[PDB]
Amino acid sequence: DSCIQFTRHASDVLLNLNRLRSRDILTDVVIVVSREQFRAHKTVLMACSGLFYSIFTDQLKCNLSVINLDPEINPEGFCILLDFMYTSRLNLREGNIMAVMATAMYLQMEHVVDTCRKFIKASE
Amino acid sequence: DSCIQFTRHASDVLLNLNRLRSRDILTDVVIVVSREQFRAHKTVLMACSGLFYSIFTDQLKCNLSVINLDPEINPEGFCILLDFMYTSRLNLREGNIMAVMATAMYLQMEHVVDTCRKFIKASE
Amino acid sequence: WVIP
Amino acid sequence: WVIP
Ligand SMILES: N#Cc1c(Cl)ncnc1Nc1ccc2c(c1)CC(=O)N2
Ligand SMILES: N#Cc1c(Cl)ncnc1Nc1ccc2c(c1)CC(=O)N2
Ligand SMILES: [Cl-]
Ligand SMILES: [Cl-]
Ligand SMILES: [Cl-]
Numbered sequence: 001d002s003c004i005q006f007t008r009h010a011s012d013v014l015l016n017l018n019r020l021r022s023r024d025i026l027t028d029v030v031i032v033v034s035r036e037q038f039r040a041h042k043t044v045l046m047a048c049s050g051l052f053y054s055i056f057t058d059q060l061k062c063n064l065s066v067i068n069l070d071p072e073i074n075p076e077g078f079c080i081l082l083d084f085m086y087t088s089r090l091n092l093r094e095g096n097i098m099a100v101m102a103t104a105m106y107l108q109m110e111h112v113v114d115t116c117r118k119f120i121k122a123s124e
Numbered sequence: 125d126s127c128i129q130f131t132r133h134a135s136d137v138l139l140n141l142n143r144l145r146s147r148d149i150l151t152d153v154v155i156v157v158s159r160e161q162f163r164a165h166k167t168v169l170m171a172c173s174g175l176f177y178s179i180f181t182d183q184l185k186c187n188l189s190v191i192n193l194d195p196e197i198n199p200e201g202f203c204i205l206l207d208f209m210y211t212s213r214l215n216l217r218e219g220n221i222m223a224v225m226a227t228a229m230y231l232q233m234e235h236v237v238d239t240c241r242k243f244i245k246a247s248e
Numbered sequence: 249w250v251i252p
Numbered sequence: 253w254v255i256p
């Protein structure tokens with residue numbers, strides 16, 4: 001086609017989706033990770049995670065307002081990945097890398113798994 | 125903070141949101157523009173348009189599944205802007221520029237209004 | 249705005 | 253990945 005493109009558009013959309021999340025506006029699911037709860041938008045979760053994409057395209061699970069993650073999942077690891085989904089920013093630190101990598105593998109977030117593997121390999 | 129950032133993340137999220145729209149997955153509103161209907165995600169509309177941001181933060185309108193636009197709004201102009209919201213790509217042409225600009229003014233999409241004004245000024 |  |  002003969003389209004023009006606004007470079008910052010995708011980043012501006014994501015910033016606004018994060019602002020809606022922070023104000024709990026039109027959030028339609030709560031992700032339960034052991035004792036912790038995280039409110040989010042199903043569409044953002046699906047757009048970022050192979051696991052959520054599978055869950056919310058399921059004819060029964062698409063209608064659930066609560067999703068319980070595997071008890072082995074670390075809430076802080078999930079929190080870091082949820083923030084990444086809404087911001088493109090990953091708070092990767094020596095103290096959380098193992099939990100973040102395990103959570104990203106479970107959530108099927110290949111690019112996060114990739115950088116975790118690379119950061120781990122550099123430290124050995 | 126000491127975060128790392130994945131450059132293509134925002135673009136990949138938007139591509140997936142557009143894929144969900146094309147397959148009518150978790151769309152929660154229909155925008156009626158005279159004889160035409162457009163299914164979309166309320167959160168994407170709010171993230172792109174000052175008018176939809178106002179509408180879906182309203183305590184009554186947030187719950188509506190159908191939104192009827194002003195009868196003066198051109199469906200093709202709306203279609204072009206809806207595609208832009210989900211892709212960052214604007215199909216701006218001599219034959220549609222006036223309709224696109226009027227629709228963007230109504231929808232409160234300042235960056236689109238700006239490029240329409242600039243393209244019009246260059247042709248006079 | 250750019251030519252993509 | 254980059255340093256933002
Ligand atoms: N929403 C949506 C969606 C669609 Cl529509 N099409 C294709 N993938 C989608 N999302 C999704 C699927 C698999 C993975 C990711 C996202 C990140 C990753 O590492 N794996
Ligand atoms: N969703 C959301 C949203 C939030 Cl949370 N905060 C601030 N603006 C939001 N969206 C929005 C408001 C005004 C305009 C646009 C988008 C594009 C434009 O030209 N005007
Ligand atoms: Cl439920
Ligand atoms: Cl990822
Ligand atoms: Cl309704």
Ligand SMILES: [Cl-]
Binds near residue numbers: 234236
């Ligand atoms: Cl805009």
